[PDB]
Assembly symmetry: D2
Homo-oligomer: 98 residues x 4
């Protein structure tokens, strides 16, 4: 990485009803192809790594799901700072989660 | 006796105090322990599982707790609810093989 | 009165292509409350009491859930205590009014 | 605008700096978006964009980065709504929602 950040992604296919886990699992598999730390939770997936890699993984993940459906709503949230390292563990420690 | 279970995610961001906002966020998270909710904090937000009304109240309090020490706060609440299957963190994670 | 400016986005997960149909229903719900409502292409901005917004949010979400099996709704709140916060004030502060 | 893959999006660039006021930084981000080949419609909680997906991703990164140059931390969000069965435009969504 050159410019590390911490992010969270959510990819939701529309028009396929409520059972969409099969599509979401596909998106998660996409992130794992990149040089990123992947921590999936029940409402999205947190990523740690190069900003460009995250942007590319986000687009691919979104696009992969869209390939199987007609509409997808995807969200990408980036948290980047200059005063400290941008890592998952640092954020967790800062709030006493470790 | 009445449980309308949903899974949600909350993020509270205090503004005007620079980059170091963890001290405020920690306080907001503490609030959740007072409610009958499952709490799973991650690096970008806090996932909650429990009654919808309880999550709405916990959200308002967490938001307000931070606003007490800062001048401005931007808070987000996302709700995921379905009526065909149980709304639990465990089931969602199992469904995608994370458990 | 505890005024805030907020944004609500509701995603209904159905098997048809028209979601706007259900979202329109959610927007009508907002209008039953004492709130200023400004809908845009990605969500609806609300201005009014925090409690009223929380109630309106819950009802809008629930109304859509009555038509589809799953709904993902988001509520974002921007509250400040140093100044009065309103839709028009926020817009003018950035020269977008 | 010029595109190969049009989508409708909403962005919010939140600077974590000194003082509750962030208007200066927010306007800076908005000016960045306007420099790209996109339709820009700012509302009180975010900025809606219409244009090519890649142009939006580029604009997003630059807006986020330009704000980060002035403050020590930035939390930026991008939400994309893309469909293949109908055109992805602000106008269509507004007409479909009863606003136009």
């Amino acid at each position: 990485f050159m410019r590390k950040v911490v992010a969270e992604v959510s990819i939701i296919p529309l028009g396929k009803g409520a059972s969409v886990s099969k599509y979401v699992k596909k998106a998660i598999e996409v992130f794992k192809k990149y040089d990123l730390k992947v921590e999936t939770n029940a409402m999205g997936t947190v990523l740690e790594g190069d900003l460009d890699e995250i942007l590319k993984a986000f687009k691919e993940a979104h696009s992969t799901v869209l390939n199987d459906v007609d509409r997808v709503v995807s969200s990408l949230k980036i948290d980047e700072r200059k005063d400290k390292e941008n890592t998952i563990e640092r954020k967790l420690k800062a709030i006493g989660e470790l």
